[PDB]
Amino acid sequence: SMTESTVDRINGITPSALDLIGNTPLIALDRLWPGPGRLLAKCEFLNPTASLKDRSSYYMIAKAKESGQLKDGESVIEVTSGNQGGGIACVTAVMGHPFTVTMSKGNSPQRAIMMNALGANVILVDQVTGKPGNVTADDVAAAEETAMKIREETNAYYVDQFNNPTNCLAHYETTGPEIWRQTNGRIDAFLVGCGTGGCFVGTSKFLKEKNPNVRCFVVEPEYNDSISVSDEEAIEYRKLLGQKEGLFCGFTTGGNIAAAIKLLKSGQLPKDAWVVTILCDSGLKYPE
Amino acid sequence: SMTESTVDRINGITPSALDLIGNTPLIALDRLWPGPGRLLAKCEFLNPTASLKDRSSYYMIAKAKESGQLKDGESVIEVTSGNQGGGIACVTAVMGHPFTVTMSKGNSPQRAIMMNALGANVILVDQVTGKPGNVTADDVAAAEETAMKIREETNAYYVDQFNNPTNCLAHYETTGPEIWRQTNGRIDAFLVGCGTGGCFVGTSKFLKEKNPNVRCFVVEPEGCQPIAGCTITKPLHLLQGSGYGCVPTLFDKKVYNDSISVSDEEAIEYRKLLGQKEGLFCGFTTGGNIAAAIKLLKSGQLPKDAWVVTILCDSGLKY
Ligand SMILES: *Cc1c(COP(=O)(O)O)cnc(C)c1O
Ligand SMILES: *Cc1c(COP(=O)(O)O)cnc(C)c1O
After folding, report:
1. Which CATH number fits domain A53-158: 3.30.710.10, 3.40.50.1100, 3.30.2060.10, 3.30.70.1730?
2. Can you tell me the distance from the alpha carbon of A264 to that of A266, in angstroms, rounded to the nearest whole number?
3. Out of A14, A43, A244, whose CB is closest to B20?
4. Residues from chain B contacting residue A17 (CB–CB below 8 Å)
5. Nearest ligand to the C-alpha of residue B248?
6. Which residue, A11, A111, B57, B161, has most beta carbons within 10 Å?
7. Position in ligand 1 atom list of the atom nearest CA A194
8. How far is residue B312 from each of residues A51, B28, B248, B283, B293, measured CA to CA in Å?
């Protein structure tokens, strides 16, 4: 695991890509936010598939293996067009698990490149109500139906990212503890968006144990509280993060940065507040 | 710099993206190569612009600042469609240097996305002899002419990646020392492709000082082996960022043992195998490096227990 590791990445040898997961830098965005207070963020784009999903992917596979639910060399299946696919693909490659992915033909082919490159068997499922570039709820229901049919036929382990509790456990045992150590306990708030919610629930649960006075915010597009963010704000702060800090990240990172700056300006926090967010993935994982 | 750093990235705070450069993991590819001997590789794709060019970019900017040649807040310009552009873009963003890039309209628009996202001012220059998707030497010469014209007006610092000796210095002072420490001195051979030649010349020079018995190999595309002295029959290959038809101007034959040739088909095969066996999606030059290192392990030219070290140059996502 990333918790018990004796691995020295700086001055030693890294046994495998699994040891590249977690213990990510916590960077100061001191140029983007020169004060008062400090904006810091976990560089989750420096995980081996360039997203925070390496953590949840690693936990969900590793814990299925430990439980006996997933046997050596046996098949894994997930429904995804996103970062979770790349993460599971990387973990299953190292651990020697055949991995099948279902996703809608609706997705840009670009969404399968990394998964396929890391040895995923990518099944493209016909759209039911959507058109190229628009994957609908019925398009997703169909991808799900294809994966369930394959799972019943093969008895592959279904990762079930949205309902697997080892998703949040990853962040409770790695992300949160790392932030607590890296800040030496100096942190007034944490904030991140929710897809599965693993990152927010796991990290916030751990931080509130160390210090219940830490304000944890969900970033909501268009638990202490929520901060709302527009697509225009996401785009603006994605660009500013690049221009000021030299980090090309995705749109959810734009949103997190824009929410964190609103939170620093609000006066809800002490004048000298240290605010921590997540740089979720690389900007390279997006077309155009 | 990356040499004097007290920064603790694991258990402390990373001041800026500059401190994300170098001290990259040296990974054991023990599944791709289960023995005998060992394949090791620097994860240069975990630099902040996902290429080894963060090192050479950082050195060329930092050393121009130290020399006085580049003043605070003054302009930088480079002719580039490549990983070097992203690296300079990242370094100049942190240090607050306006950065202008020239490149041929011939290049895919995709080649400008990262540079532009990190605040690079991208000037697209009309092709002279090439067509969309085919950038010729005359197309590149034109981009150069546009950058020199702009440089006359603005007096920007010209990075000059193919002629800047601080390119090699980067790898002499970081890459080589890291490999030497991370292996605790156990390395029988080093190998990497050559574009500018910084990585090979710098790393090899340092390793041969620690141990002159370390064999250092250049990875060359089949039919494009200038450094080996062989005639060029195939100018076009898939090893993007390396395998230029000329012996690089920064090349130093005194840290060179031999060349290992690789086909396009081998680059592709080992790019895929690196992904399927190790979970690392890297670029074409990484495919080539892995295929040359495996060929070198299988050859029997080295001891059966040999430790061979190469470079995972960039992410597969940059293509
Ligand atoms: C998964 C993901 C999120 C949200 O993470 P969860 O832990 O699933 O809530 C945010 N941004 C990106 C880019 C993601 O891939
Ligand atoms: C630049 C580059 C090389 C060559 O390294 P040099 O130090 O320029 O010789 C190899 N691979 C990739 C992907 C590069 O970008």
Report:
1. 3.40.50.1100
2. 6
3. A43
4. 27, 278-280
5. 2
6. B57
7. 9
8. 19, 12, 21, 8, 12
